Point group: D2
Chain length 482, copies 4
């Protein structure tokens, strides 16, 4: 039911052309709601990926010579086409990933914003004129594109993560070759159709599908891949960083987080409950910024949990294309197993399930939104990310205790807390060890802000004025003989 059926394609985008696997191999794409088959995308080997990388290298050589105005115009055309076809893209995203159609459309728009922002940033790549060491010399600092970039995106955001990687790379003058997740490769191919329609030159943007490990090896071992941007799990990031060591490749990583959610006694309780609802249960808890631990002060915990239960009662599961549906199915059975393991550990270690705690009657990978009280810091959920709709509530008594507990983790992606006092807000926001802190709000996604984490959560930033730094290399030129 697509207004533009060309946005659904069964071929990979290599050297600006639509190709299939030369051995006929393919990977099926299935709808998570009922397992229905969608299409067979090509399964590309290492040789086709090598040819794609060579094409991307030539295209990058031709693409860095264009003016910043031309590249910005191409990126703006791509953004306009993405916003124009947002309904078809949202339908494809909901079909492949399973999130509610409203969430899919919100993702498409709020992440085409990244393409718009970096189209603006393409014209602001400014060098420097540094004072010289003597009268006979001047100093220029030029910023130049690093080269061919390789992007690896997860199933978590089939469209959202692609724009925030392709935008800065293209704006800087770099070429991109993207390997999307095999579970949800259709959003990438639709964006490739739009990019070709937008005037992106042949080879500058490429989407390759296939077995993840061989393509990652080709990305890590090809000398013509200057930079690799990766979003995904911590283990695959560590594997990539180990494999890219032999070539000294620039690596930008966004890995998992364990986001605390603190509610102080001087907070707005209704605002705190709304923020917890949007931070935890968005994408059915499958978001890298999703809250994973909810800390409440002892004097407020009862009222917070009462309002939270009242709000969780209103959640409705079902198919994403169904009106009134807030929660879609988990990505696969492993997510259900992990969520069950976390709930079982919570129950055994002393916690109490207040709501949910079992698979929903819909069957498949659907799960009831679970609210559990009495969680402690020894529990599995206290140190591990569920990626599923579970709301563990830990109680505290003092600000420094919750600061000690919230930083008791190796992941530094996101954190949230609710308070009114300015001194407390500044103190807690500076003390929390995270890349991003949301104060009195559960929504932090922004193409103008430096999205990214610290510690094991990865390196580099996405969006803002710092998002293009990783794709550029400095060149210090000393002009003598004046």
């Amino acid at each position: 039911a697509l207004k533009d059926p060309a946005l659904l394609t069964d071929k990979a985008f290599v050297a600006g052309a639509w190709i299939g696997a030369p051995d006929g191999k393919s990977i099926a794409v299935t709808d998570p709601f009922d397992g229905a088959l969608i299409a067979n995308v090509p399964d590309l080997g290492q040789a086709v990926v090598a040819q794609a990388i060579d094409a991307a290298a030539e295209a990058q050589k031709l693409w860095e010579r264009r003016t910043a105005k031309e590249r910005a115009q191409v990126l703006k055309r791509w953004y306009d086409l993405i916003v124009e076809n947002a309904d078809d893209l949202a339908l494809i995203l909901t079909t492949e990933q399973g999130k509610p159609l409203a969430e899919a459309r919100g993702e498409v728009v709020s992440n085409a914003a990244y393409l718009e922002w970096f189209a603006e940033e393409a014209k602001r790549i400014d060098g420097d004129i540094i004072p010289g060491p003597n009268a006979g010399q001047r100093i220029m600092v030029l910023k130049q594109p690093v080269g061919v970039c390789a992007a690896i995106t997860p199933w978590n955001f089939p469209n959202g993560m692609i724009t925030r990687k392709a935008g800065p790379a293209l704006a800087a003058g770099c070429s991109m070759i993207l390997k999307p997740a095999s579970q949800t490769p259709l959003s990438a191919l639709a964006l490739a159709v739009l990019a070709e329609r937008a005037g992106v030159p042949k080879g500058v943007f490429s989407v390759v599908t296939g077995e993840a490990k061989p393509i990652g090896l080709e990305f890590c071992h090809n000398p013509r891949i200057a930079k690799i941007t990766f979003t995904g799990s911590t283990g695959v990031g560590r594997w990539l960083m180990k494999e890219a060591a032999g070539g000294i490749k620039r690596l930008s990583l966004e890995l998992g987080g364990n986001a605390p959610f603190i509610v102080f006694d001087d907070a707005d309780l209704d605002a705190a409950v709304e923020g917890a609802m949007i931070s935890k249960f968005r994408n059915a808890g499958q978001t890298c910024v999703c809250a994973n631990r909810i800390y409440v002060q002892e004097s407020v915990a009862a009222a917070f949990t009462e309002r939270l239960l009242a709000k969780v009662s209103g959640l409705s599961l079902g198919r994403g294309t169904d009106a009134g549906v807030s929660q879609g199915p988990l990505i696969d059975e492993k997510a259900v197993a992990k969520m069950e393991e976390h709930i079982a550990d919570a129950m055994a270690n002393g916690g109490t399930v207040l709501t949910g705690g079992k698979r929903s009657v819909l069957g498949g990978t659907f799960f009831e939104p679970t609210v559990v009280t009495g969680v402690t810091q020894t529990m599995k959920v206290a140190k591990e990310e569920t990626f599923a709709p579970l709301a563990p509530i830990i109680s505290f008594k003092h600000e420094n205790d919750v600061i000690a507990m919230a930083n008791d983790s190796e992941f530094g992606l996101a954190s949230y807390f609710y308070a009114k006092d300015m001194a407390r807000i500044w103190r807690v926001a500076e003390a929390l060890e995270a890349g991003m802190v949301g104060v009195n709000t559960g929504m932090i996604a922004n193409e103008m802000a430096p999205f990214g984490g610290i510690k094991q959560s990865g390196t580099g930033r996405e969006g803002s004025k710092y998002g293009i730094e990783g794709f550029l290399e400095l060149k210090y030129v000393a002009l003598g003989g004046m």
Copy 2:
């Protein structure tokens, strides 16, 4: 013969205290000129290094809470003490490394400049106030110290590389634990004496000596080491990056380069010869920015080589503390063997040794400055770094040919060319694939410029306004409930 004998020490600096190895093990330091023994520094194991890292962590916790003015004042005091004791530091450096005393003093001053610059930068770590997405929210971007940093420095610059790593780390509010090269550990310990005298708090600066591999493993595997800065060979950098993968550690690497030196027919020949003399033969060719290939256009090559031979005839070898001595001994016998191998390959492959080509009559590790004509692109020196005073001269005919030849390498550290036309200068400087380009000058060292390389030559920059970026982490704070 030291004005301040306390600048020569036989102990490592751990937790702000002077300690020795608890097992009595030690590493001897010898003078490269005649093998004379200087002192026995401690050989520290992994447990002492672990305790040092813990102390550095506590010190960093206390040191990031100080105001930027206090940290800048401490760094400025350290710079003042370094400049005041420049003669003793230069004598220690010449004794341990072998470079001429004038070069040692120049190194000490021109690299204390880094400490001064980053003392100034400590007070300019500014956040951002980004426009909000709606009236109810504001956006702050804070910059915070990454944590405990570990520095590994080579024998190449026993003092120079330490200031440009300790300055930005301390200015950002990070703590440093440094492992200097075992060949030349005395400059680091002298700087540690001065740092303690300058008011650096206990644990903020640490110097540890011992076997390189166990300390590097401890640096890579300790969770309390947030960042690792390394300067050295490409192989050790690759080993470090592979070993740091399991912890997702921020890695800044300055690795080797293969610097071309181009002389066009529209160049100032006397200036070109002076630039080649300072770029190639400084530190007896043992510099990461030293020229390694000298390209000359066909119509200028004869006059350039005649003037170059006239200038090389004036070079004088001997002990560093001897007046009129321009060249000191190579670091060890491996450097002599590599230089001999390069000369032999040049002779066998068709090249002609015009001057030098053998060890000097002084014996030991001294080598005659060698000028060889007829070098080609298949020669070992054309793709490998000698780190020794050899001047290979390759001839070309056209600008694009020399651009193809100069970029025919995996190392992107430095490059030099001599030309007068503005269009040619801009075109060649933009086409050359290097981190740093010196136009009409063989001297590019500058604490105000972004020192660093591209491709395999490493990641990150030293000095300038970009030198402190690697030691800071961004924190995006979204302040809701307005």
Copy 3:
């Protein structure tokens, strides 16, 4: 012959509504080619302007509260509408001002670029987070809109000067009330129609026509006018600055210049002649950046003047809407009188008219493009701006002599020189006393560059990242009690 006849209007834009003079008074607009009447715009008194300023104040209060995204979207819509209707706008501009239709269209597009650039800049108004003086205090630096801005534009660019004033003002969140030149008020009103169509809120943009002096007095004496941007002659700028003194109003002025054009013996002669043709004879010499003195070295002067005469022979006068017409009529008879006076002074003082030197056979205000050799520094044209198509050629012998002669003026707007040597280019470009220097090019208009002059040529800049600074005020907030 307008595709959209609503772009031609006979009413002023006040409080977001189209109004006429309440006393029936009006100002006629006539076509400079043959004096044909176009329309009668209102002649507004000081009371109507006062009401307009009050409306602009209320609108600014409502308009600074909108998000930067909304204001950028409005500005981008305005830019899109301007580019879409570029042909009708160009026809109106050619009818009112007289420039060739191709030049009018080029003006419309290349100055809507300013609106696009400042729409991008609207989202990049970033504050600062400065390190505090102690642990108990933080420092924010906010940037806020200055308030209601008043713009005064000349007949020189009926459309070009309006976008580069309205863009930054609206992007910053300021409101604008513009008084265009009485000779060419129709382009401003057409842009007002488009702005209303683009969603600019009522009062944020206002166009008022009438007697210049009373409206300027109202602008200078109204306390609700925070800032005044003026483009025009030096005398009116001095009058405005004297009249705005009593209120301490922020004043940005772009006044006249006396642009030198130097041709060195190492220059590209064909490029120099093309640059002189575009710099001097564009807009029939009626441009603030137009070359006014052409200096040539003694060894190149003959060939330069021969090629220049060959190129001037190809100029064709006539109506702007006529194919092949390069030169339109001067604005009025005063321009013809001034050009005749300059030619007469040149002839009497020793110079020789090589080409032109009299009114063309077309009659009216048309003038033959004049090339005069033998000009000296005592001549009237050497120190005064003709604003008419005369090419005075002064010869020199040395670089320092031409540097002394080119800086022998109180105006610092623009300068041009042609040379190839990098050292000479840097030296002369740094020595020339001008806001803008065009090296080897006669075209410098750019919305990404800081357009503006020094000395008597005015204060402030237009375009680039510095163009929005004048419309914002800093606010240093010190947050204590941490």
Copy 4:
């Protein structure tokens, strides 16, 4: 009683030499405590000032050619000499102006900080490399010194205002000629002695004394004066801006303010009283940032006024060189008359004097610190600046009412308020119409912050990264022929 008697001088500093008036005319300097004569400084006419301006022009020509490192080193030497001689400078300042010796020393140190900061900024004057419009052109933006600057300083801070004007001017490469207030010219001459001792070249720094109006006329009418920085009253600023109009001179003005002081019901009352004590009664209320109106919410006013009276009881008047003295005499009898007029208007219009209200028993220009309750918005003090130690207390009931009352003034220099809620702090700080806002603190002086006002309080900023912008001019260079 000076450790260095050369810091007290009776001559003006012109062309780097110490001169007297060629007609023997002089101006006496008297101690405000008892009228005791100190020294006779020269009274310089317009011809000597013209010669000084010519010398400053030549010196600026020689001084902009020095490297940024050399100028920064000179400025740092000047700062070091100022801090070393802080006691003699403080004694001179207390003798000439009358403020307590502790305040004089604090002024000397905290304003030599400006010299240090701008010495650091001298090396950070960076140009830009903007992306070109096509492949054949590049764009540089250079920052160059504006030229010769003229500074006019008040008696308010005999030393404080001089460093924050001379630092940025010298760092940018501009020359300064300063005319200090005739009441307190000795601090300027002492700083000139130190500047000569610090290696400031002849003519770069000049101090001229004499009749204010002729020297101001010479500053405004000399074509070689590029920029004028003025600190003082609004009327003299308006006169200067009117007189500088004929030459289109860059004018930076810091004029008077009417600073509100708001205490909300959610504030820390002890902190509010301490902040009011330091903001109001510092320099006996003779400060441009001194609080002038104290607003208190109705529910807190009684306790605030009780604590304020308890703190005002502890103030001690007398000679500045006396231990335990907090308040010195007013500058002259006009200040006493104005303070008496304000107190009389407060008493007549309904207000009640709670403490003080008359001249102290010490006689002369001493005045008792006065606290008056019941002040309204019609009172003279509500719209006029006393510059004397009077604490008018106005009561309010709601936040928007106090926002309306605080902005009910044409002066936008400083404001203070005390609150704890983050939303209230952000809202009020953004709503207040002032250049500087001090939240929960009465101290805002900082060389790293943009000191300056809005509206009639003046234009431009002092300190921070924006303090050097006014002394530099942009130069857009377009390099064609690539």
